[PDB]
Design a protein around this ligand. Structure first.
Ligand SMILES: Clc1ccc(OCCCn2ccnc2)cc1
Ligand SMILES: Clc1ccc(OCCCn2ccnc2)cc1
Lengths: 325, 325
């Protein structure tokens, strides 16, 4: 029922965006169908975990607080697609990083997806009292992610920033603010329950779940094979500031660091194999299990602290925590 | 005095944006100075014609309608820099069209410049009654330009769209809505005189000045040498939908069209020279003078129509019209 409603609102959002281009933007049907195929290619495909979280938060607050129910659940789907659309916007900008007409259309697709988030927000929420407050928080979170992508890309151009605290800063700005905080806030805004929750504990629960997911995603990037992971692990070649790197540099000898600095960030499949060997000679996967368990306990405890002031909110957070755990 | 005020507000805007990153975004000084050098590189350099137009409109309405004057002129400079910042955002996206770290930073610079337009608007206008109305019109004009760039880039991928009307559509959405309409609207919004002007005539005057500038810029792209123009003319090689092309196809014989379709859009310097030869054998520059004079007369007449309902507004439009003419 939630997913069935989510894809139905996608038809409602896509119809408005394309018809507006046909009627009020003087666009020919050829480019209109071109944008339909482009929208479905970029927005549809993933698991929609960021969007469906907004719905799960909204349905918990209306029943754990008749015509008002249909409005909030509809606003949640529009807010959920705002994230999925902006998620596709960043993914299109990633394909560029990896008279040419296929690159010009790629940049244009990224600008349109970003613009469509404002169009659907200024439309379905034109009469909502939170349109001005939602767009401001939505922009700063988009600003935060662009800043976080600067922390991550320039993590080796200025090993001085290979610290567990800087790793927290990257995951916080690059990932945690858009995955584990943004959908929770948009669920409280459509339900008109934003000031009725502990934002400090909500923020604290957001960064910890991002730390839990990013660390697990770094171990799978290095150890899970490409057929079981679904992608080719390139964090070692890209010299990324992963959890495996900052943990290795702390418990490695002065030689294992020198052998690490001479083999890290190289495309040689044998140097990367020498880096994976050092990661296992350091028993990092042993520390990986205990590290996630420590963060997992902090998640379970902070859910109870937010439960004393927001009972129905914690039920949705436990569901979001169950997705990563 | 206007330009001296404009660069002074740039210091005020840059100081807020960078300090916010240092205090509320946990950014190290290395990246802060990196963003200062990047901001000055992209935003500073041009003639600032789009930004200064907002100031020229604001100063005409406060004297041709004491503490209220300083507020409107300050809002005009912030609104003027919103355009210059977003202008640099599109320019950065153009350099991309023409683990690599120099391309990742290019995409990141484009996202930050776009985000900074919202940050400076949500800051300096946090207490203005037009913050919600300005951001909505600012986004749709940004949406319009991204749509116009789709009309222009795909003008030969779907010579069927090489018509004088489609040329108007490209210039309208790609150029006229951001150069000759956006600065005029932001000047009326900061002066609280938006509903006191004929928007239809204001829109009509906007597209005509864009048509006047784009046509003149197409002739210089083909005939003005690179040292006098300042750039290498590549519209013929790129197979652009320029005014010289749509005018040629209308007055060329069935052979001159075949010789045009076989030499247009090619990088061969001899095929391009064969296209320039056809442009002069058709006496297009003779039609170019009379075409601009016809549009120039429509500009002078529409200034009088807006003068009957807005006297001080026309004085600023005549100044903006004097920049292109
Ligand atoms: Cl407000 C908002 C901010 C960021 C969003 O997505 C982040 C995607 C970044 N990314 C992920 C993989 N490659 C790039 C969605 C909404
Ligand atoms: Cl709202 C707004 C919309 C568009 C703006 O700039 C248009 C620049 C497009 N361009 C020009 C040369 N290459 C790309 C500024 C403000």
């Amino acid at each position: 029922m939630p997913m069935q409603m989510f894809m139905q609102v996608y038809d409602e959002i896509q119809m408005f965006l394309l018809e507006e281009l046909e009627l009020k933007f003087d666009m020919d049907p050829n480019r209109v169908r071109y944008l339909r195929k482009m929208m479905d290619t970029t927005c549809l495909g993933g698991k929609y975990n960021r969007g469906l979280t907004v719905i799960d938060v909204a349905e918990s607050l209306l029943s754990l607080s008749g015509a008002r129910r249909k409005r909030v659940l509809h606003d949640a789907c529009v807010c959920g697609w705002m994230i999925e659309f902006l998620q596709a916007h960043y993914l299109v900008e990633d394909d560029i990083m990896d008279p040419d007409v296929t690159v010009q259309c790629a940049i244009n697709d990224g600008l349109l997806l970003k613009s469509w988030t404002h169009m659907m927000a200024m439309h379905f929420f034109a009469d909502r009292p939170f349109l001005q407050d939602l767009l401001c928080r939505f922009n700063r979170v988009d600003y935060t992610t662009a800043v976080g992508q600067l922390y991550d890309v320039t993590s080796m151009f200025d090993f001085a920033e290979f610290t567990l605290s800087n790793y927290k800063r990257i995951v916080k700005y690059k990932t945690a603010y858009y995955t584990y905080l943004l959908p929770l806030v948009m669920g409280l805004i459509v339900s008109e329950a934003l000031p009725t929750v502990d934002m400090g504990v909500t923020e604290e629960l957001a960064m910890l779940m991002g730390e839990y997911f990013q660390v697990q995603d770094d171990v799978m990037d290095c150890f899970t094979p490409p057929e079981r992971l679904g992608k080719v692990g390139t964090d070692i070649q890209d010299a990324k500031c992963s959890w495996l790197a900052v943990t290795f540099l702390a418990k490695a000898s002065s030689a294992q660091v020198a052998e690490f600095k001479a083999n890290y960030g190289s495309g040689d499949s044998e140097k990367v194999a020498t880096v994976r060997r050092l990661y296992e000679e350091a028993d990092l996967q042993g520390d990986y299990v205990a590290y996630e368990a420590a963060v997992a306990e902090q998640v379970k405890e902070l859910i109870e602290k937010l439960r004393l002031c927001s009972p129905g909110f914690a039920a949705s957070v436990e569901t979001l925590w169950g997705k990563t755990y």
